[PDB]
Design a binder for this molecule. Sequence first.
Ligand code: MG
Ligand code: MG
Ligand code: MG
Ligand code: MG
Ligand code: MG
Ligand code: MG
Ligand code: MG
Ligand code: MG
Ligand code: MG
Ligand code: MG
Ligand code: MG
Ligand code: MG
Ligand code: MG
Ligand code: MG
Ligand code: MG
Lengths: 394, 199, 153
Amino acid sequence: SHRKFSAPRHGSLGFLPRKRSSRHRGKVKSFPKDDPSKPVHLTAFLGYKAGMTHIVREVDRPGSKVNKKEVVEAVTIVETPPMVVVGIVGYVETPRGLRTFKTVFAEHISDECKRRFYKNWHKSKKKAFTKYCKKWQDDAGKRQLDKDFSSMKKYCQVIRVLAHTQMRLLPLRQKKAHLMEIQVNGGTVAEKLDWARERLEQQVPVSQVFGQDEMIDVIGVTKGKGYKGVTSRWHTKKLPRKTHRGLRKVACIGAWHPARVAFSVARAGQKGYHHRTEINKKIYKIGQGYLIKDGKLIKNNASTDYDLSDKSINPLGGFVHYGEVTNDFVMLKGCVVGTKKRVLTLRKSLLVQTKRRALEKIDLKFIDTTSKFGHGRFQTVEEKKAFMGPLKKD
Amino acid sequence: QVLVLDGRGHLLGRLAAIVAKQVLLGRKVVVVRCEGINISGNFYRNKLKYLAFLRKRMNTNPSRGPYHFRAPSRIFWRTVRGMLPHKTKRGQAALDRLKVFDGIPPPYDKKKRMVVPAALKVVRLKPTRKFAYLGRLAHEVGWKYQAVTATLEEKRKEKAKIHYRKKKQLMRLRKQAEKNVEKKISKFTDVLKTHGLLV
Amino acid sequence: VRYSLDPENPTKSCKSRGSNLRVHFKNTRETAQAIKGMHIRKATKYLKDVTLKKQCVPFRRYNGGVGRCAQAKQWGWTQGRWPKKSAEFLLHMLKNAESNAELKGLDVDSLVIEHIQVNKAPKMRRRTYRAHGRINPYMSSPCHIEMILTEKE
RNA sequence: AGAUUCCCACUGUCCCUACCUACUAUCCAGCGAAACCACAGCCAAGGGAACGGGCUUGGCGGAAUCAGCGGGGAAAGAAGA
Ligand SMILES: [Mg+2]
Ligand SMILES: [Mg+2]
Ligand SMILES: [Mg+2]
Ligand SMILES: [Mg+2]
Ligand SMILES: [Mg+2]
Ligand SMILES: [Mg+2]
Ligand SMILES: [Mg+2]
Ligand SMILES: [Mg+2]
Ligand SMILES: [Mg+2]
Ligand SMILES: [Mg+2]
Ligand SMILES: [Mg+2]
Ligand SMILES: [Mg+2]
Ligand SMILES: [Mg+2]
Ligand SMILES: [Mg+2]
Ligand SMILES: [Mg+2]
């Protein structure tokens, strides 16, 4: 007969292959649309999650109760060291899709990138791809280079560029680096290629890619949680107490006459470690690293206009499971995808953002230092000393 | 030893009624440009005739369901697979002789293509009726590649205008040396007229 | 006695055979298929690294419910296990065969095993006790073994 | 230790689900069974002893396997009480 009482469906069929993702690093599927109007510029960027903290700002929106009141918000911290360009790669336009055409590397590839291509760096004799780097010092090579580049002048339509991250500047355990392709949008191919030819074997920081409080998208891989059931997975109800063969189940699987089982019934498997793509996270602040000038180091990162203390964005006793921050950082809004020490892929916005809340300009007032590692009750070191006093340990 | 075919102006059932016999009789056929084919009947009836085929998916796991191809090639290959015994080793060893392309690839542009007259819209339709294209149909039903095909079918028409100009340029030179010489080939034509070659 | 497969030249071949051994039959079949073409100083190193869980023995046929291992990715197969008795009771056989390959007066350390064969055996009988006063049998499964070495340089 | 209804105190029965622990299951060394089985195992419609795992017309199909799972096999039990 019919179901007596109506109900909405549990879960979504849009994400149904809930499997362990075949890639750990995030993968950009959809780059933004170019036009020959604007000058050339990159689109995506690659960073590393560290932790979370408060913020306290003022709100400027007319037509609400919160106008001109000091609200608080919750942010993340994403450490973004400068990236290195190690090669270009073109693409052609076909009716069967979009075939790749030609790839041209640089002369002195660092050993951080010589790693990724290997598995067992200790046992290998480190023949680190040194016939191709005979093609940047001999005059039999710069012909085929000038004809490769004139081929990508003529026959190429989209030019992505090969960049790898920089691992010497991180407190992580590993020593291997992440390569990635990033698409350059701009004018014609002649301009785009003469721009990127110059940047070859260089550092590219964040601020020559982004700006401030532009709405961006975050592509990353979920925290993983093992082989969970169907209550923890699809979030259904539990059966009552008087049952016999368990109670965290789903009772009626399918109907009779469809002799199969439908593919939309909630079954038990893997949970987490998936690919996901969040949209419209807004940036509040782009800090700067520990730079040493005139002997000592200057670390007034978190010095706002109103606190104007010299404290940085490292809390007391370091971030948990990450370490300390010496490089720069972006400061997002809301939670993001991925556990700690997880690599994360940023991207500018697909959408023509024109509303009243994505045009709001942002002023901070007070960045917290909450040593989660225990309840916080201080902000920095010396105030804790000028408040407790002298100790027996001294 | 290998046939070629155009796809403009030919019908869909009449072409596949010639081709599913000529394949089984041992003859490699390649049919190029299968987006200029047109279908009998008006447009919106063949679109509701096709979206009532797109609504038919196997219910419990559609990945096992009817693979709805959307290209005009894998539609013409669909409506040949129906005219063949595709369960047996004399069907599966015939479909690997047929080869269908969207647009026209470079291996088959510098070759003279043959044209079937028995399947043309101007012959097999009264001229007061309606016909419907297939390309604009596939674009309306989910084909993403007309903005590439239209310009790759523009760069070869521009290459063949040039090849027709240098075909005319050698032909005029041929008819002027054939005007200068015929003093000395006056005798090698009074032997051809009486055998019927230059009338 | 008369073995199944006749050797090529009994000058170069040493023989051995064990009757009515108490092991399983299937474990011993498979670990007596991984060994067929090796050298004797490799086989006596393998059958120890089977004991100490270094190299594994892949179950190809009798694989019901047998879990997988990573070390069997050498043999290009997923399901392996590390059986102990079936590697002891045909190592004490390669000491019998080596001593008779010395008594006949051949060269020991160039023997290539060419033939090994395991048969079924007469089943023993015990009994066990189930519900409602029923009795189910609890039989074993021993095996026969015979093998032919050969010097192949 | 009988059957019905109402109010006080108390409560994870419930809104609405979470977390910890023990022995199990899971993988390994050892020992090691039975119930059952014509041949075997992907689906829609049609006819048909009027609801097929096989025939017909179509859709389609790629070894060998592990942990789960209860829709089906008009499942197993017992010559319908
Ligand atoms: Mg409903
Ligand atoms: Mg009960
Ligand atoms: Mg804490
Ligand atoms: Mg902590
Ligand atoms: Mg088997
Ligand atoms: Mg018992
Ligand atoms: Mg008893
Ligand atoms: Mg065991
Ligand atoms: Mg019937
Ligand atoms: Mg049946
Ligand atoms: Mg049959
Ligand atoms: Mg069932
Ligand atoms: Mg039943
Ligand atoms: Mg009866
Ligand atoms: Mg009776």
